[PDB]
């Protein structure tokens, strides 16, 4: 997250870190045994780390649980990034508490201008790299479809939206992929892609979770 703030320990209790001997992507806990992340974050060897603040220190409140299922959307397109969503089933259920909590799925899509909370352990610099120990947060609005498409012509599918800013300085960045965009208490987005981070006229692009609620429910029910 570039241009954000330190969230504070466990203030985003649905935020998970996906770990393979290092943090590589975020995710969002949606029930005690399932996490939403991005399709492009799929790999072998995923350990889900719940309850984290400082990802480099065992502070208390962590739960480390292996993925037992990693389910990339069957129609994920790795060149266009359409359908950039993955479900992870945890090998055992997480112990839910005030520091480890699920986030609700949308009942409808969000409107432009709604303020959302974007969070993660990604790079905090728009030029160069700095990876934070503790979770970072950014308040950011949903952009209109027409402005999103103006910024990224021919690339924004019906399963994407833009959020953030156009003046530069505030965005998600590398290492934030897969993590949450939460707007009035609903998981509306998954950090996906952009042209750089925090660049003028190049807002972040996010998977539109409201299009996948039925797919998520059907997939969880069958697994």
């Amino acid at each position: 997250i570039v241009g954000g703030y330190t969230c504070g320990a466990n203030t985003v209790p649905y935020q998970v870190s996906l770990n393979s001997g290092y943090h590589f992507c975020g995710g969002s806990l949606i029930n005690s045994q399932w996490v939403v992340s991005a399709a492009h974050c799929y790999k072998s060897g995923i350990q889900v780390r719940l309850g984290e603040d400082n990802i480099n220190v065992v502070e208390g409140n962590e739960q480390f649980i292996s993925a037992s299922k990693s389910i990339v959307h069957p129609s994920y397109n790795s060149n266009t990034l359409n359908n950039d969503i993955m479900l992870i089933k945890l090998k055992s259920a997480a112990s839910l508490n005030s520091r480890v909590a699920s986030i609700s799925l949308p009942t409808s899509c969000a409107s432009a201008g709604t303020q959302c909370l974007i969070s993660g352990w990604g790079n905090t610099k728009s030029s160069g790299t700095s990876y934070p120990d503790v979770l970072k947060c950014l308040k950011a609005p949903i952009l209109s479809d027409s402005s999103c498409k103006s910024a990224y012509p021919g690339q924004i599918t019906s399963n994407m939206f833009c959020a953030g800013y156009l003046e530069g300085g505030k965005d998600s960045c590398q290492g934030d992929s897969g993590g949450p965009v939460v707007c009035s208490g609903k998981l509306q987005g998954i950090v996906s892609w952009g042209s750089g981070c925090a660049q003028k006229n190049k807002p972040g692009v996010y998977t539109k979770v409201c299009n996948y609620v039925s797919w998520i429910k059907q997939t969880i029910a069958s697994n």
């Binding site: 290092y22 492009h40 590398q174 992929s177 892609w193």
Partner: peptide, 13 residues
């Protein structure tokens, strides 16, 4: 340029 926000990024020309 156009890149995913993973470690490492996946980028497109």
């Amino acid at each position: 340029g156009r890149c995913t926000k993973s470690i490492p990024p996946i980028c497109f020309p």
